[PDB]
């Protein structure tokens, strides 16, 4: 199923002809020839794309006047109507906007655009809207529909960009050497960083809507910089005397810095700047991906020789990335067409049998006892005690939240089954719970709250969710009932991992070098236990997962096995002061946001590949695997 889609293109080319599987791009000047005066032009747009500037540009090119514009909203019907009447008598152009709200005026338009009420020639109408059903099809049945989401392929977006700001940006130079190369650099950067998002959370934590606005912003800056640099240049040594490090900072943090909500993306984007700009215009070198000559149609040909489908090592990113993308892509595609084809039963009994399998509650009158009875960092160092030792208070907090969830689950399973077999006036929440129990997804009652109460959100009803909760409670109980500190802690189970680590810090400060060591003086570090087969200060973590290399002697991953185990990364803390190293994050879930960043780990294992290689490769040490 990985290579479904190209095969799809293939037999389509066979049974229907290869002409179908070939690019199309709509010449807006060509499209204008279709629009008679008596039919409008609709526009089903997507986020981060608008043809309004191009429509205006054409209206200045062929037509000689600026169009008039009315934005839909509230209290704009009569305004729209009177401007349309002016257009009717005269023959101007009108730009409606935001029809996705304020639909009451739409039905009127079909009556207006009629043969009865006569209209002066050369009058066009341009409509724009968005995905709102309950949109009567009077005009959908009679209009011209056009889509202007940005192009897919790398060459596609590159070519389009090479038909946005062209032939007078390009042709106005007074220098074929330097800033021609700067245009080419920035354009390639644009087209690469936009397309990086195709992979998913590996490439970008969330989606960002870069468009051309940032581009011509940067172009306006750098043209000012070069014009006022060379304004004092009476003679060019070799075409320029620029010190291009400021431009790095600008294109890094100011122009494109607007969208960026994450921290890691900042230095990731700086790295892309480093590797692509090179900190110099070589003039003679091979881009990692060719390099140009100085003529326009030559740029068009340069685009022509670019391959259609590329491989992700162009971005620096590993081949295996490809795999996951295709799978999810295939997984949705068939489902689309799968739609076009022409409960209160033993499932609740299955849940009924389930609820007599999750464990019993832990009454606090017992638990407070048990936690107070036994506790210490080291049996020799201290006698049993409760509050004072950080790990015991952590034990109590974790048991508290666990019980808070256990009670809710037991109660709602009961009251879900006690409506039919039992009796109560049916609730809507309980009905939602029934539907969720039949499907794979757990009800919202166990994940979220009106603000947010994330607990253990995993996919299956019981395959992993209750499995995970059971494992958490098992380890927590054996961490309590015996009361002894086991080796190989499971970090995923703890609701608040960070408290674990800071408690370890406090433990080291108190037990050792106490006072010789202050809390604010201590800093953090880690040594990876490079060993299969095996206390001192620090902890032993079990269950981390790496992505994309080995533990030590890190190398390229094979085609399968994208997610790999993580060995025992024993910790270390030291008083402060008492660039070959690479620093990795640790994300709880594989969603990869600013939240869930528990801590950062230095991983020196380099060999020949400098760390920036790894930084663009987007390694990370996530915790769960989903």
């Amino acid at each position: 199923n990985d290579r479904t889609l190209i095969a799809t293109q293939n037999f389509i080319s066979n049974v229907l002809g290869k002409e179908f599987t070939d690019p199309i791009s709509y010449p807006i000047e060509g499209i204008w020839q279709e629009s008679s005066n008596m039919d409008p032009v609709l526009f089903l747009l997507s986020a981060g794309a608008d043809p309004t500037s191009s429509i205006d540009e054409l209206a200045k090119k062929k037509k000689k006047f600026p169009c008039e514009k009315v934005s839909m909203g509230e209290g704009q019907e009569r305004v729209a109507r009177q401007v349309i009447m002016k257009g009717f008598v005269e023959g101007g152009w009108v730009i409606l906007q935001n029809c996705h709200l304020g639909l009451k005026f739409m039905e009127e338009i079909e009556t207006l655009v009629s043969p009865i009420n006569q209209i002066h020639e050369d009058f066009r109408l341009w409509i724009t809207c968005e995905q709102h059903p309950k949109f009567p099809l009077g005009l959908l049945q009679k209009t011209l529909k056009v889509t202007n989401e940005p192009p897919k392929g790398l060459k596609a977006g590159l070519y389009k960009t090479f038909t946005t700001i062209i032939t007078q940006e390009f042709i106005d130079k007074v220098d074929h050497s330097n800033w021609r190369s700067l245009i080419f650099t920035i354009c390639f950067l644009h087209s690469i960083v936009i397309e990086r998002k195709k992979f998913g959370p590996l490439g970008w934590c969330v989606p960002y809507e870069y468009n051309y606005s940032d581009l011509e912003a940067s172009l306006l800056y750098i043209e000012k910089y070069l014009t006022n640099l060379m304004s004092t240049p009476q003679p060019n040594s070799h075409n320029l005397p620029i010190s291009m490090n400021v431009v790095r900072y600008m294109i890094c943090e100011v122009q494109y810095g607007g969208r960026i909500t994450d921290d890691l993306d900042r230095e990731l984007f700086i790295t892309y700047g480093e590797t692509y700009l090179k900190d110099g215009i070589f003039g003679n070198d091979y881009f990692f991906p060719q390099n140009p000559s100085a003529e326009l149609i030559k740029y068009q040909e340069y685009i022509a020789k670019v391959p259609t489908v590329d491989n992700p090592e162009v971005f620096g990113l590993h081949s295996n990335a490809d795999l996951t993308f295709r799978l999810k892509e295939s997984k949705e595609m068939i489902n689309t067409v799968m739609e076009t084809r022409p409960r209160e039963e033993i499932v609740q009994d299955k849940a009924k049998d389930m609820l007599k399998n999750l464990p019993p509650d832990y009454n606090d009158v017992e638990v407070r006892e048990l936690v107070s009875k036994l506790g210490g960092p080291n049996p020799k160092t201290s006698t049993e005690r409760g509050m004072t030792v950080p790990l015991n208070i952590f034990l109590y907090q974790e048991v508290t939240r666990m019980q808070r969830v256990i009670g809710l689950v037991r109660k709602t399973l009961q009251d879900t089954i006690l409506a039919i077999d039992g009796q109560i006036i049916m609730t809507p929440e309980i009905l939602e719970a029934i539907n969720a129990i039949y499907d794979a997804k757990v009800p919202n009652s166990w994940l979220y709250d009106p603000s947010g109460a994330e607990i253990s959100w995993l996919l299956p009803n019981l395959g992993s969710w209750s499995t995970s909760l059971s494992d958490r409670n098992k380890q927590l109980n054996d961490w309590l009932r015996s009361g002894q500190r086991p080796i190989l802690f499971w970090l995923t189970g703890f609701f608040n991992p960070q408290g674990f680590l800071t408690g370890m810090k406090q433990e080291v400060t108190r037990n050792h070098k106490k006072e010789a060591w202050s809390l604010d003086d201590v800093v953090y570090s880690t040594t990876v236990k490079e060993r299969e087969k095996e206390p001192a200060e620090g902890v032993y973590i079990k269950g981390l997962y790496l992505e994309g290399c080995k533990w030590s002697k890190n190398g390229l991953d094979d085609s399968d096995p994208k997610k790999i185990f993580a060995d025992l990364p024993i910790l270390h803390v030291s008083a402060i002061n008492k660039s070959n190293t690479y620093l990795c994050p640790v994300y709880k879930y594989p969603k990869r946001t600013d939240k869930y960043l528990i801590f950062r780990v230095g991983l020196p294992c380099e060999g020949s590949n400098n760390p920036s290689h790894w930084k663009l490769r987007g390694v990370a040490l996530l915790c769960s695997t989903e």
């Binding site: 986020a47 981060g48 935001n98 304020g102 306006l220 006036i425 049916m426 009106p450 608040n496 408690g503």
Partner: protein, 1300 residues
């Protein structure tokens, strides 16, 4: 009777009372005194006199109020119709105003004739005229808007002013007086201006302005002279415009001088001589010029002169830091100095590492440099490339802020965006310095910024008004919380802003604005900003037309170390760098590894609060080590919010960072701590405990520091009492204090802040804003504390961000902006936050009450103190001698000692204690009445009886027998005389003697045969219900008694039956009754309507002869109203403000800030076994109602016996059919049992529901044919007389059961 006349400029004279504050206030405590007297027992005679007196006083008030309001309307409209052209151009309402002038003059002359305002108000004709005149004057204003728009056009700033206040501004009637109270909301910082009369020949002397003043606090101020003067004239726009211009010009010239003086005189002289703004400019220009000179001197050859200039700055640092910081006079002068100090700290920090070879180097081309050009005399501020001239606005001393690198990122970004003609729209989480960063870039560039506050109740017309003002003037706008706004409004705003962007792009002097036909001009130095907040509840998206304009600035994590260290430098500390790390690490650790509670906050607002606190402590004489002072400050600040458990963790964490220090005492304030027990003893029912000392003092401190605060904590915990007692102690030592209350979800937010009317196209006033305007007047003596009280839902609260932020300005969709004063504070008596984003958690301080602060036992001792007040013979001692051990060591052995696992109403047990106390008082009321004192044993029996119910009222028979066995095991005697399988509940204690008996009296029916006429019979359940009810309902409004009751029973378990049995027994000659029912979509306005129609009078202002009898409000089911999505239902809150306090706010489109009063009412309710599908009532409300179960009867063979007896004794022909008839009475029951048990409801047959109603319907069908059944003779179709009867039984049972 002293009154202030406007003038004699016509035949008549129009006047107002400028002493009326004294009138109102002394009136208020007059009526307080009169009610205080009347309530007391020994006030027999005064009733004839006093009521009449109060009545007159009450009545005169509202008449006066209406009158003076109309006067203000007229006092706005007079100058409008003096001008010839406008009077000509609209003759109709001009002559209507001639008519009102005639009528108004007649009223004034009648008042003049009277000479005394009280007979003047007593006139009855007046009252009809006044509101009709009011409405007509509203119509006149609705004529005058068409001229208001043009007058606004003639001068920019009026766009940031609302309509009626603009009218008042335009009706000056005087040079000095009228505008002297309005300079604040028309310029940035000016508040006072002198007026010097120049006597022109033959013209009256014209007042002219000569200097300007910025006042902060009371006496501290900044004065600015003027060489160029400004003269008043005939046209208000003229002298306002001249004020602006001449200000700009003199500011320019003083700066032009000051730039020479800076390098001539030397540091100290010009910093001391000049004002703050010019001083900061001088420092910046000196540094840039000297650093430049050093850089070129490096360029010539290797030189030390650059190092000499850097050393000169370093030398300047010590002289500024040593003297001007530690000792100084006055607040304004104080703020100036550290404003210089922070800049200089950052200055030297940059200059240390400033390794740039020449001016062209980027490291030099990264900061906000300045150059005051001489050859063309003008300022010019410079950034990387952008440049712009200083805008010359007098601001005086403002507390500008530190410069972290992130602020540099913002500065560079915003300069670039403004160079490309856009508007920055920064974003991030709450409290990272967005709005203040914008405001500071405004302040440094010399411009004046205008923050507003969008909200869902906005409309595009007002945004257009704003933007027109922005383009006309040259000012900057910062639309805080721009996202929380309607979608289509954003759709049209997209157009407006795009039009202005294209206009500015061409550099075109004149341009066209959409929707507005007249052509309008532009000034370049404008800008737009929206500080939107990504992602909450009630937050929409920007349609893609609008994302084009603004450039993003991502402000996620502010710096926290550098700001702290430079602030500590600014105060003048010596242990800077260590302490900074201490602050940061402590607040971090506290954030992560402490328990998760919704209300905790450790953001930058808390930190800055600590810093602005910490200034004074070092300013005190002590030279003790700084770290001690700092530990004390941090610990004592952050204690208040923490719940019980987190306190040990918090101070154990403190010990790990300051191990050198062991302990310090808390600085204790002696006056208040000695004062508190005095009034705690002054009351009857108040027990002092140490926890109260701690919490009330903590409240005092957080009051002292911050704007507003919250009292989070569970029910019955003493919050309102704490507020009351605090207000008392503050008032005792002078400095009075007043408190107002409000309930936000018992009124609709549209009414709370007012909207534009949705019928007549005209504004209505808002309640909360009316209280705001009435409160923040200067020249008062109170210190008002507006109390909101309810839940915290985000939708209504969150549009008070500006008032609770450092802006402390209220902003409306009207266009009205009201400035906060220090006279006023905002408080919330809310239970707990569960629907609050951090943007509202971090804005205000907070204090947490805990359940164990005031145990129920202390409340019992307070009641005991009351018993030793009058009935002090021995009763307090005797009663309690059982109570203490009988309550402390018993109550917790009922919750789950024995099973008791069906407490239908989950509660906290303090409510049970309030309940049993209220019951016991009514129990002993009879022997209080006869003045008889009893032995100990009878009292023990009474307590057993009292608390049997009121803890036994929430349980079923099985739990009740287990309860009973407990009481047998370890309690005082219950009935033992027979106890033949009968519980303790069955019997009652008799007043006449110590006995445990019970019965239901015999009573049959009247002769009528209607099923209603067979209304109800005397059951056992009904009689015991009356027994319990009557005790509470006789008690006369004791504290902790609302005189309100509430039953609990299944749907069809004799609710309205027993209640109506009670209600018939009323005496309508001194006791009335009213009925109401509840459904899901019953709204607060509906309940408001029914209660207003019930009373029909405002019984607060000495009214309602017919409501003087006592009334009762009965409600069947308080559960059914629709719970909101959050979980907080919005109907019961009106009831809760009715029970707790009586009365509410009016909504009659005429007056807002005022409340009707209920001086007498009664209340009763009934529940339906809450749990599962049945809703529940708000827990805050559970504290007031008596709650107990209403079980099924288990005796239904004996309810219907009589009606069959009375039917039976007509024929007398039933030799054997009588026994049969009784068997029918029992066999219907057998059938009922079998069918009800066997066949059930499922969601496909949900309505398969059975109760006792159908038995009544069966009998109702049977009871017919008083003798027609006998007439079997016509048919006799093998029919005995009984056969027809059993056939009737069969058909009946089929049609009542075998149908649905």
């Amino acid at each position: 009777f002293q009154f202030g006349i406007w003038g004699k400029r016509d035949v008549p004279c129009m006047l107002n009372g400028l002493i009326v504050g004294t009138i109102l206030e002394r009136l208020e405590e007059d009526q307080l005194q009169l009610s205080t007297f009347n309530s007391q027992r020994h006030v027999t005679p005064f009733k004839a006199e006093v009521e009449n007196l109060i009545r007159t006083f009450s009545d005169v008030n509202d008449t006066l109020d209406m009158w003076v309001k109309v006067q203000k309307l007229w006092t706005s409209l007079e100058p409008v119709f003096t001008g010839g052209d406008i009077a000509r151009q609209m003759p109709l309402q001009a002559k209507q105003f001639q008519g009102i002038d005639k009528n108004w003059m007649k009223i004034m002359e009648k008042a003049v004739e009277t000479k005394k305002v009280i007979p003047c108000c007593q006139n009855d004709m007046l009252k009809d005229f006044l509101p009709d005149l009011n409405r007509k004057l509203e119509d006149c204003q609705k004529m005058l808007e068409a001229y208001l728009e043009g007058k606004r056009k003639k001068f920019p700033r009026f766009y940031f002013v609302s309509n009626p206040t603009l009218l008042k501004i335009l009706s000056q009637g005087s040079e000095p007086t009228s505008i002297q109270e309005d300079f604040e909301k028309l310029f940035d910082a000016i508040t006072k201006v002198t007026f010097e009369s120049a006597k022109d020949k033959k013209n009256p002397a014209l007042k002219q302005i000569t200097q300007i003043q910025q006042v902060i606090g009371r006496n501290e101020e900044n004065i600015s002279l003027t060489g160029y003067y400004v003269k008043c004239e005939g046209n208000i726009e003229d002298w306002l415009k001249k004020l602006e211009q001449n200000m700009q010009q003199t500011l320019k010239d003083i700066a032009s001088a000051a730039a020479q003086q800076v390098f001539q005189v030397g540091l100290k002289e010009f910093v001391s001589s000049q004002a703050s703004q010019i001083a900061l400019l001088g420092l910046q220009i000196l540094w840039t010029s000297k650093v430049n000179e050093g850089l070129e001197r490096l360029s010539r050859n290797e030189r030390n002169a650059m190092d000499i200039k850097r050393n000169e700055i370093k030398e300047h640092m010590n002289i500024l830091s040593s003297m001007c910081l530690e000792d100084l006079n006055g607040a304004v002068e104080r703020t100036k100095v550290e404003t210089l100090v922070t800049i200089q700290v950052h200055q030297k920090d940059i200059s240390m590492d400033l390794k740039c070879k020449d001016v062209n180097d980027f490291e030099w081309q990264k900061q906000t440099r300045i150059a005051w050009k001489t050859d063309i005399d003008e300022c010019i501020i410079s950034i990387t490339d952008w440049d712009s001239p200083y805008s010359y606005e007098f601001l005086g001393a403002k507390e500008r802020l530190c410069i972290t690198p992130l602020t540099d990122r913002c500065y560079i970004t915003l300069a670039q965006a403004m160079s490309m003609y856009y508007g920055g729209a920064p974003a991030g989480p709450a409290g990272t310095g967005k709005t203040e960063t914008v405001k500071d870039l405004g302040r440094t560039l010399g411009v004046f910024v205008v923050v507003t506050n969008c909200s869902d109740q906005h409309r595009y017309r007002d945004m257009a008004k704003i933007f027109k003002g922005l383009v006309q003037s040259g000012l900057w706008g910062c639309f805080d919380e721009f996202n929380r706004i309607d979608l289509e409004v954003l759709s049209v705003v997209a157009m407006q802003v795009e039009s202005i962007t294209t206009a500015r792009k061409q550099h075109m002097k004149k341009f066209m604005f959409p929707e507005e036909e007249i052509e309008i001009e532009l000034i370049p130095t404008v800008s737009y900003f929206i500080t939107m907040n990504p992602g909450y509840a009630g937050r929409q998206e920007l349609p893609e037309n609008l994302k084009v304009l603004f450039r993003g600035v991502s402000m996620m994590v502010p710096d926290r170390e550098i700001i702290i260290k430079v602030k500590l430098a600014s105060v003048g500390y010596l242990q800077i760098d260590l302490l900074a790390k201490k602050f940061n690490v402590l607040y971090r650790l506290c954030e992560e590894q402490l328990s998760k509670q919704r209300h905790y906050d450790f953001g930058l607002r808390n930190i800055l609060s600590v810093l602005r606190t910490a200034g004074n402590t070092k300013r005190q004489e002590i030279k003790s080590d700084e770290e001690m002072l700092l530990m004390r400050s941090l610990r004592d600040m952050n204690l208040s919010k923490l719940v019980a458990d987190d306190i040990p963790l918090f101070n154990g964490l403190l010990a790990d960072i300051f191990p050198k220090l062991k302990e310090v005492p808390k600085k204790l304030y002696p006056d208040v701590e000695k004062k508190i027990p005095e009034e705690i003893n002054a009351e009857s029912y108040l027990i002092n405990t140490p926890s109260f000392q701690l919490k009330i003092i903590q409240l005092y401190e957080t009051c002292l520091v911050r704007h507003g605060f919250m009292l989070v904590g569970p029910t019955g915990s003493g919050k309102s009492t704490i507020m009351k007692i605090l207000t008392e102690v503050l008032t005792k030592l002078g400095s009075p204090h007043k408190i107002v209350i409000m309930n936000p979800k018992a009124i609709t937010a549209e009414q709370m802040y007012g909207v534009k009317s949705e019928i007549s196209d005209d504004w209505i006033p808002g309640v909360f804003s009316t209280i705001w305007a009435k409160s923040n007047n200067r020249a008062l003596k109170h210190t008002t504390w507006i109390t909101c009280d309810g839940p915290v839902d985000a939708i209504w609260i969150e549009n008070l961000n500006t008032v609770l932020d450092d802006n402390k300005i209220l902003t409306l969709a009207n266009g009205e902006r009201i400035a906060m004063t220090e006279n006023c504070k905002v408080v919330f008596e809310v239970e707990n936050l569960n629907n609050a984003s951090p943007a509202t958690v971090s804005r205000c301080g907070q204090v947490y009450v805990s359940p164990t602060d005031l145990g129920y036992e202390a409340v019992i001792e307070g009641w005991i103190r009351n018993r030793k007040a009058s009935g002090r013979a021995e009763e307090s001692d005797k009663l309690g001698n059982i109570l203490r051990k009988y309550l402390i060591n018993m109550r917790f052995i009922e919750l789950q000692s024995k099973e008791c696992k069906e407490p239908m109403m989950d509660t906290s047990p303090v409510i049970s204690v309030i309940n049993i106390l209220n019951l016991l008082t009514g129990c002993l009321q009879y022997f209080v009445q006869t003045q008889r004192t009893l032995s100990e044993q009878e009292y023990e029996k009474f307590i057993v009886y009292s608390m049997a119910w009121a803890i036994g009222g929430i349980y079923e028979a099985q739990d009740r027998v287990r309860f009973h066995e407990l009481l047998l095991a370890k309690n005082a005697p219950i009935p033992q005389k027979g106890k033949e399988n009968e519980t303790v509940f069955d019997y009652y204690v008799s007043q006449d003697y110590l006995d445990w008996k019970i019965c239901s009296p015999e009573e049959w029916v009247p002769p009528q045969s209607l099923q209603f006429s067979q209304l109800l019979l005397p059951t056992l359940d009904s009689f015991r219900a009356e027994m319990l009810l009557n005790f509470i309902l006789t008690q006369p409004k004791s504290h902790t008694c609302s005189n309100s009751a509430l039953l609990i029973g299944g749907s069809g378990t004799a609710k309205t039956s027993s209640v109506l049995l009670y209600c018939n027994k009323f005496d309508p000659q001194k006791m009335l009754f009213k009925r109401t029912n509840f459904s899901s979509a019953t709204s607060p306005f509906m309940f408001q309507s029914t209660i207003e129609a019930e009373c029909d009078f405002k019984v607060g202002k000495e009214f309602a002869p017919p409501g003087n009898k006592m009334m009762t409000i009965f409600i069947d089911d308080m559960s059914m109203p629709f719970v909101n999505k959050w979980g907080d239902q919005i109907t019961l809150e009106l009831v809760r403000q009715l029970i707790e306090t009586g009365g509410f706010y009016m909504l009659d489109k005429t007056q807002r800030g005022n409340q009707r009063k209920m001086k007498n009412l009664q209340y009763i309710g009934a529940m339906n076994h809450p749990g599962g599908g049945r809703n529940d009532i708000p827990n805050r409300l559970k504290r007031q109602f008596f709650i107990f179960n209403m079980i099924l009867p288990l005796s239904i063979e004996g309810i219907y016996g009589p009606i069959i007896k009375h039917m039976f004794k007509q024929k007398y022909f039933s030799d054997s059919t009588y026994k049969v008839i009784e068997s029918l009475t029992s066999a219907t029951i057998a059938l009922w049992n079998k069918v009800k048990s066997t066949m059930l409801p499922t969601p496909a047959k949900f309505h398969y529901v059975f109760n006792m109603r159908e038995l009544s319907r069966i009998f109702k069908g049977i009871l017919t044919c008083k003798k027609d059944t006998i007439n079997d003779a016509p048919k006799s179709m093998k029919i005995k007389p009984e056969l027809f009867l059993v056939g009737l039984w069969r058909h009946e049972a089929e049609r009542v059961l075998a149908d649905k």
